[PDB]
């Protein structure tokens, strides 16, 4: 594990946002670019409203759990 230090000039300090589909059967958390907020986003947002083509559908599965042992 590693602590995400916030202040070091070295390293990527980009943010990360997640949006949950509006449909119940979905309820999946899609990944957006990074300059998007839920406050400005619509209430009926869905996977089809995703920026990542890799996960811009309601049929695409959620990002599998990653993590080295
Ligand atoms: Zn969906």
UniProtKB/Swiss-Prot annotation:
Tissue expr: Testis.
Effect of residue 18 to I: Loss of histone H3K4me3 binding
Source species: Homo sapiens
Recorded superkingdom: Eukaryota
Zinc finger (CW-type): 12-66
Effect of residue 65 to E: Silghtly reduced histone H3K4me3 and non-methylated histone H3K4 binding
Localization per Swiss-Prot or TrEMBL: Nucleus; Chromosome
Annotated effect of mutating residue 63 to R: Loss of histone H3K4me3 binding
Mutation effect (residue 65 to P): Loss of histone H3K4me3 binding
Effect noted on mutating residue 62 to A: Reduced histone H3K4me3 binding but complete loss of non-methylated histone H3K4 binding
Protein name per Swiss-Prot or TrEMBL: Zinc finger CW-type PWWP domain protein 1
Gene this protein is translated from: ZCWPW1
Positions contributing to Zn(2+) binding: 21, 26, 47, 58
Comment field on protein domains: The CW-TYPE zinc finger mediates its binding to trimethylated histone H3K4me3.
Transmembrane segment boundaries: none
Known function: Dual histone methylation reader specific for PRDM9-catalyzed histone marks (H3K4me3 and H3K36me3). Facilitates the repair of PRDM9-induced meiotic double-strand breaks (DSBs). Essential for male fertility and spermatogenesis. Required for meiosis prophase I progression in male but not in female germ cells.
């Amino acid at each position: 594990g590693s602590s995400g230090s916030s202040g070091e000039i070295s390293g990527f300090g980009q943010c990360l946002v997640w949006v949950q589909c509006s449909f119940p059967n979905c309820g999946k958390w899609r990944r957006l670019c990074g300059n998007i907020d839920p406050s400005v986003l619509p209430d009926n947002w869905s996977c089809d409203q995703n920026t990542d083509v890799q996960y811009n559908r309601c049929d695409i599965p959620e990002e599998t759990w990653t993590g080295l042992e």
